[PDB]
Amino acid sequence: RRYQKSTEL
Amino acid sequence: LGSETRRLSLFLVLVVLSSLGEMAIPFFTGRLTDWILQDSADTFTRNLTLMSILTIASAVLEFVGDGIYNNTMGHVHSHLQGEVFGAVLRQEVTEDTSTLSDSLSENLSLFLWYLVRGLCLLGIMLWGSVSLTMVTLITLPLLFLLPKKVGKWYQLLEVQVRESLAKSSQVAIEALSAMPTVRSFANEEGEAQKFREKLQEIKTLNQKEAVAYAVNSWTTSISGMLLKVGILYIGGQLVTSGAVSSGNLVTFVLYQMQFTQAVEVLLSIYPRVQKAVGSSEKIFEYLDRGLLTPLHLEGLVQFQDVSFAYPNRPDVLVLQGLTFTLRPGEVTALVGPNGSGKSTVAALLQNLYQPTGGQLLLDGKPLPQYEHRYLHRQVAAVGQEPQVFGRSLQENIAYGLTQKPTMEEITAAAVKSGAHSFISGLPQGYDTEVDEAGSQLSGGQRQAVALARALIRKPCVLILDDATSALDANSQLQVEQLLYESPERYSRSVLLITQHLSLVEQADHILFLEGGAIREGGTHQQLMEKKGCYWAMVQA
Amino acid sequence: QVNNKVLMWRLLKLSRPDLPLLVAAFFFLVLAVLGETLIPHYSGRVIDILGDPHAFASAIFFMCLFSFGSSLSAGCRGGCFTYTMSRINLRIREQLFSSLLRQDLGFFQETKTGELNSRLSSDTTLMSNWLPLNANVLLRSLVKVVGLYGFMLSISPRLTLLSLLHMPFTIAAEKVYNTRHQEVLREIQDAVARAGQVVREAVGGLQTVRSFGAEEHEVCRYKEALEQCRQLYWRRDLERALYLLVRRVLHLGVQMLMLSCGLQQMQDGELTQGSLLSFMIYQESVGSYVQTLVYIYGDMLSNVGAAEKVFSYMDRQPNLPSPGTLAPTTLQGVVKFQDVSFAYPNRPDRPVLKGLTFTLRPGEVTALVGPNGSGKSTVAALLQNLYQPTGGQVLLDEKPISQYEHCYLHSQVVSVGQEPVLFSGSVRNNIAYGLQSCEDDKVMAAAQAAHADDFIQEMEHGIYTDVGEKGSQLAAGQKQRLAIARALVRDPRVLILDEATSALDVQCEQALQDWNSRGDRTVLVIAHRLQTVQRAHQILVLQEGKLQ
């Protein structure tokens, strides 16, 4: 699996 | 974790292979570039087939490896939780392990994947062009210092804001949990003012949190742009010089982008792994901190120089040289000072703790030598604090039973204990489930359930005490009448520690202890008609 | 439904005072999106030019300027939206807390404190992300998609048709995966809660388990719960990997179909190299936005539901009677009960009082005795206007108690609770609770009236120390004498005692029942024994809801 980035505000 | 040393090794192979299979999209891309400036279709087809095959194989291998790792980690987590709970229950927190294991597993998997990826990318880049790789390695640390510094400050501000919000929450829950007093004193405006004053402090921190967020975003973008430009300039100059072709430059650029992404992921992931590893040691430390065969007992017990104490220290002993004895088929009661703690003797009768001195052998056999499985179902009785578990009533009234009793047997046991009426009056019969921890129970119902649970196993000794204290006067009278009306006085030994003299009136031989040993005793009629303790208590 | 539209309108109106911030945010967002759209076009034109210094310099300068401007706007917008979110959260929490304090006592008798904590700690944050997070990402994501497709159609009107045909196979897959995940998560949560309940039950009944030696069965039940949860964990972990594999395979195929078609079109002569590079960049970038749009639209509904759940608490109507206005200057203190009957709304049609009737006088210290299933507590409570009697009436100085002002009434009449409760404030704040202002001279006088000074005065700084949380450091007897001092600091005209002598000294009770606060002020004391008989001027027993 691959890293998931948090949505930018 | 050692028992799964093979499977994990298999995983540790597959990931590596996958990490080599996904490096075929950049490489061949550059190759295609070097094909477009030197214009057959045979090489184009070969490159396309190689790229597609390698990518498909990498995807499949990654899927298989992830499946194997998740399957192993689930079993490891379940086993760890089971062992933790068993140790905790026998010792006499649980959710901490459950909330830690998933995070630890996920972060470890991501760390391993991206570390292997980064290693493979660095190796292929170093084989590709030494000079550009050296330039990238030199300029990486200088462009990866300030963003961490800004991010730490932003994270500190965020955690401060969250802590302040939690403080205000309680400042509110505490106020809302005692409404009758607040309404009685007409002090709602004070509570509103206190909450507003609490919020006026977070209002200050939010501004600096926003400013730090903006500055962090700017710094990250600037570093990201500068890093790429620094290597693009030197790559362009090298290509113009004519030492290397354009396809090699394209492959190196793609590899450098992927390598930077991998390094950034690793830096983001590592602290969580460190925190979880540090936290698991607390759970570890908290977790790490044969009998003769019995056949039957006639109910004959006796003690000589018996002593017992609290687990904290042997100096908290509540007995010293006791000589308690109850004949088989005879019911007796004991009395003493409230602070003497004679109730532990009942625990000594249940073999909960080994004697601190002498012996407590009963029925011609040592007390701690019989099998625990069969002894607990022949020497136990109603506890000092009646309660009902969250299971079904048909199961609550027979808890701790190796074999579930039949409906007729359960009904007979309840009737002998007077609990048949409670079972009949309960809706849906015995299939009804009682509330957890006695949430909807009653004193009389609890006493009846305790008596039924005691008498279901046909005990060879009775340690019933304080059961009628929680029960009502009518229930106590019914229990006393049932005890007195049993066939030939139940044809067994009873050593009930009664709380009222009404039960002790018909005692075979009453006794009272003082100083850790029995100090007086005899017949109830003789005790109440002489200078004994019973007569003094009755007169007083 | 229209309920969602109503909730959305309410959430819009809640954010009305944030216009100067929202305007700047929605300006910076547009600037950033417009800047980020145009870079690959200039990259492609630079590539084409390389294969005239003026055009090259112009293109390079424009690309750099757009990159820098977009980089700045992408941070300014985030800062503004973060500040707006924080403001909305702090605004909604205050309204939610200030609306609950006006509810009736039955609402708190019924509703569990856990629900109130959940509303005031978790949902008030979930409903605060609606405008600054969801309606922001959705807008930019959709706009960016429109701009990218416009540029793609401009570059090549034929290659874009393949992406337009391919998109549904991505949209449907993302929707299905999100739908499955959203339910797997809640199933896992329910299983975890059920597993924890077993440990809670084992902890609750520990003594019986140790007495019967049934640990080997509780361990088995816990292991069964864990084995039930592990399967759900494994199912989720498998579904995620399957989705990832499908996504990877689909993308490679699309790219190879794009690469092959683009090369075959260029070798014909209808395209250039920079145009192909720009088209490839656009086609690569469009998919992430297409997926995140679906993600955000799916996530917004949870925030809407949380907002509905929060708003359902502050719109409920209370059950208090009509407010009063009267406030005489000198209350006589005569209290009369006339045919008073009462039934709790929580357990209706099971009356505790059946036509109770009695009369109180200033000097006539009246004592109530008799268990009556602890019904003596109910008659004390309804004398403070805490509950309204369903039958009969209770009157103060020939007027109903409900006709007096709420602030005024609780100054003349005060009662001491059966189980005293103390607050986490200082000693002075607890004694002067509810008062607008007080002087330390009165606090000493109030404290000396209950002999609590023997404990307070040993303590450093006197009355300014912090009492432990909910009176944790105080003893049972100490709390009783502190609660008494909270009453005579107010100089009451009517006094009610809920068996304070059960823990406090009997002589102290006599002094409290005979001092200036009780010399000519009506005193009603509740006793569980005949101890009140030594001073009661009018003893009154009541059983089964009927007076003796």
Comparing CB atoms, the residue among A1, A7, A9 nearest residue C244 is A1
Identify whether residues B361 and B243 lie together within a single domain: no
Identify whether residues B279 and B309 lie together within a single domain: no
Torsion, Cα of C104, C105, C106, C109 (10° steps): 140
End-to-end Cα separation, chain B, in angstroms: 68
Identify whether residues B409 and B492 lie together within a single domain: yes
Residue B207, token pair as written in the block: 């501004």
Q: Breaks in chain C follow which residues, C to N over 2.5 Å?
A: 51
Q: Which residues contact B184 (CB under 8 A, 6 or more apart)?
A: C384, C386, C410, C414, C415, C417
Q: Which residues contact C413 (CB under 8 A, 6 or more apart)?
A: C383, C384, C396, C492, C493, C494, C495, C496
Element housing B252 (H / E):
helix B246-288
Please report the residues numbered 259 through 288 in chain C whose beta carbons come closer than 8 angstroms to any beta carbon of chain B. 259
Amino acid at C285: S
B110 touches A at CB < 8 Å: yes
**B115 to chain C nearest CA, in Å?**
19
Q: Cα separations (Å) of B278 from B159, B285, C225, C230?
A: 20, 12, 27, 25
Identify whether residues B247 and B120 lie together within a single domain: yes
Sign of CA dihedral B433, B437, B439, B444: positive
Comparing CB atoms, the residue among C116, C233, C407 nearest residue B186 is C407
Q: Is residue B171 part of a domain?
A: no
> Which residues does chain C have within 8 Å of residue A5's beta carbon, measured at their own beta carbons?
none
Q: Which residue of B has its CA nearest to C380?
A: B184
| Of the candidates C406, C416, C388, C413, the residue with the CA atom closest to the CA atom of residue C334 | C413
Determine, for residues B86 and C219 on separate chains, whether the beta-carbon distance falls below 8 Å. Answer: yes
**Strand bridging mode C494-498 / C413-415:** parallel
Residue B242, token pair as written in the block: 């004519």
Residue C410, token pair as written in the block: 């609780």
Identify whether residues B284 and B314 lie together within a single domain: no
Q: Are C497 and C509 in contact (CB under 8 A)?
A: yes
**Strand bridging mode B517-522 / B510-514:** antiparallel
Comparing CB atoms, the residue among C75, C94, C249 nearest residue B218 is C75
Pairwise CA distance, residues B69 & B172, whole Å = 45
Q: Locate tokens 């009804």: which residue?
A: B432
Q: Is residue B329 part of a domain?
A: yes
What is the CATH classification number for the domain harbouring B225? 1.20.1560.10
Determine, for residues B66 and A2 on separate chains, whether the beta-carbon distance falls below 8 Å. Answer: no
C371 marked among binding-site residues: yes
Pairwise CA distance, residues C387 & C392, whole Å = 13
Pairwise CA distance, residues C269 & B213, whole Å = 49
Pairwise CA distance, residues C201 & C220, whole Å = 14
Residue C175, token pair as written in the block: 């929707």
DSSP 3-state of B306: strand
Pairwise CA distance, residues C37 & C278, whole Å = 11
Identify whether residues B129 and B232 lie together within a single domain: yes
Count contacts between B and C (CB, < 8 Å): 205
**C216 to chain B nearest CA, in Å?**
9
The DSSP bridge partners found for residue C498 are C526
> Which residues does chain C have within 8 Å of residue A2's beta carbon, measured at their own beta carbons?
244
B405 marked among binding-site residues: no
**A7 to chain B nearest CA, in Å?**
13
Taking each continuous run of H as one helix and of E as one strand, the counts in chain B are 20, 9
Identify whether residues B249 and B363 lie together within a single domain: no
Q: DSSP E strands: which ranges in B108-238?
A: none
Pairwise CA distance, residues C71 & B306, whole Å = 84
**Residue B459 — φ and ψ, nearest 5°?**
-70, 150
The domain in which residue B348 lies consists of 301-539
Pairwise CA distance, residues B48 & B188, whole Å = 75
Pairwise CA distance, residues C542 & C311, whole Å = 45
Element housing C522 (H / E):
strand C522-526
Residue C188, token pair as written in the block: 């896992």
Pairwise CA distance, residues C429 & C3, whole Å = 46
Identify whether residues B269 and B358 lie together within a single domain: no
| Of the candidates B360, B262, B379, the residue with the CA atom closest to the CA atom of residue B302 | B360
Pairwise CA distance, residues C145 & C530, whole Å = 85
What does the buried/exposed string (b/e) look like for B336-359 if buried means 16 or more CB atoms within 10 Å of the residue's CB?
Answer: beeebbbebbbebbbbeeebeeee
Identify whether residues B283 and B337 lie together within a single domain: no
Determine, for residues A9 and C244 on separate chains, whether the beta-carbon distance falls below 8 Å. Answer: no
Q: Which residues contact B506 (CB under 8 A, 6 or more apart)?
A: B331, B484, B524
The residue from B266, B288, B310 where one domain ends is: B288
Pairwise CA distance, residues C119 & C129, whole Å = 15
Identify whether residues B463 and B384 lie together within a single domain: yes
**Strand bridging mode C366-369 / C538-543:** parallel
Please work out, in degrees rounded to the nearest 5, the angle formed at the alpha carbon of residue C469 by the alpha carbons of C468 and C470: 105
Q: Which residue of B has its CA nearest to A9?
A: B213
Pairwise CA distance, residues C62 & C42, whole Å = 8
Q: Is residue B183 part of a domain?
A: no
Sign of CA dihedral C440, C445, C447, C453: positive
- Data resolution in angstroms: 3.5
**C287 to chain B nearest CA, in Å?**
18
> Which residues does chain A have within 8 Å of residue B214's beta carbon, measured at their own beta carbons?
none
The residue from B288, B320, B354 where one domain ends is: B288
Quickly list H helices, B299-417.
Answer: 344-349, 372-375, 393-396, 407-416
**Residue B60 — φ and ψ, nearest 5°?**
-65, -45
Identify whether residues B310 and B387 lie together within a single domain: yes
C370 marked among binding-site residues: yes
- What's C489's DSSP letter? T
The residue from B288, B313, B331 where one domain ends is: B288
Comparing CB atoms, the residue among B110, B217, B269 nearest residue A1 is B110
Q: Is residue B60 part of a domain?
A: yes
Q: Are B90 and C216 in contact (CB under 8 A)?
A: no
Q: Cα separations (Å) of B348 from B464, B519, C212, C537?
A: 14, 19, 14, 55
| Of the candidates C249, C257, C265, C245, the residue with the CA atom closest to the CA atom of residue C283 | C257
Q: Which residue of C has its CA nearest to B347?
A: C211
**C210 to chain B nearest CA, in Å?**
8
Q: Are B512 and B336 in contact (CB under 8 A)?
A: yes
**C143 to chain A nearest CA, in Å?**
16
The DSSP bridge partners found for residue B331 are B494
Pairwise CA distance, residues B470 & B386, whole Å = 8
Comparing CB atoms, the residue among A1, A8, A9 nearest residue B113 is A1
Residue B49, token pair as written in the block: 């087939």
Determine, for residues A3 and B265 on separate chains, whether the beta-carbon distance falls below 8 Å. Answer: yes
Comparing CB atoms, the residue among C81, C292, C296 nearest residue A9 is C81
Counted residue by residue, chain C has a size of 548
Pairwise CA distance, residues B335 & B54, whole Å = 86
The DSSP bridge partners found for residue B365 are B362
Phi-psi region at B364: left, alpha or beta (left = phi > 0; alpha = psi -120 to 50)? left
Taking each continuous run of H as one helix and of E as one strand, the counts in chain A are 0, 0
Pairwise CA distance, residues B250 & B235, whole Å = 9
B268 touches A at CB < 8 Å: yes
C105 touches B at CB < 8 Å: yes
End-to-end Cα separation, chain A, in angstroms: 25
B336 marked among binding-site residues: yes
> Which residues does chain A have within 8 Å of residue B69's beta carbon, measured at their own beta carbons?
none
DSSP 3-state of C543: strand
Sign of CA dihedral B309, B315, B318, B323: positive
Q: Are C229 and C195 in contact (CB under 8 A)?
A: yes
Pairwise CA distance, residues B212 & C132, whole Å = 18
Pairwise CA distance, residues B229 & B246, whole Å = 17
Q: Are C293 and C141 in contact (CB under 8 A)?
A: yes
> Which residues does chain B have within 8 Å of residue A1's beta carbon, measured at their own beta carbons?
66, 109-110, 113
- Structure solved via: cryo-EM
Identify whether residues B312 and B250 lie together within a single domain: no
What is the CATH classification number for the domain harbouring B378? 3.40.50.300
Residue B109, token pair as written in the block: 């998997």
Task: Using CB atoms, list chains with 3+ pairs below 8 Å to chain B.
Answer: A, C
Residue C137, token pair as written in the block: 């990402």
**Residue B145 — φ and ψ, nearest 5°?**
-115, -55
Pairwise CA distance, residues B224 & B216, whole Å = 12
B229 touches C at CB < 8 Å: no
C302 marked among binding-site residues: no
Q: Is residue B438 part of a domain?
A: yes
> Which residues does chain C have within 8 Å of residue A1's beta carbon, measured at their own beta carbons?
240-241, 244
Q: Is residue B177 part of a domain?
A: no
Q: Which of B44, B48, B66, B349 to mutate to test the interface with C (most CBs of C within 10 A)?
A: B66
Q: Is residue B246 part of a domain?
A: yes
Q: How many domains are contained in chain B?
A: 2
Comparing CB atoms, the residue among C74, C241, C470 nearest residue B63 is C241
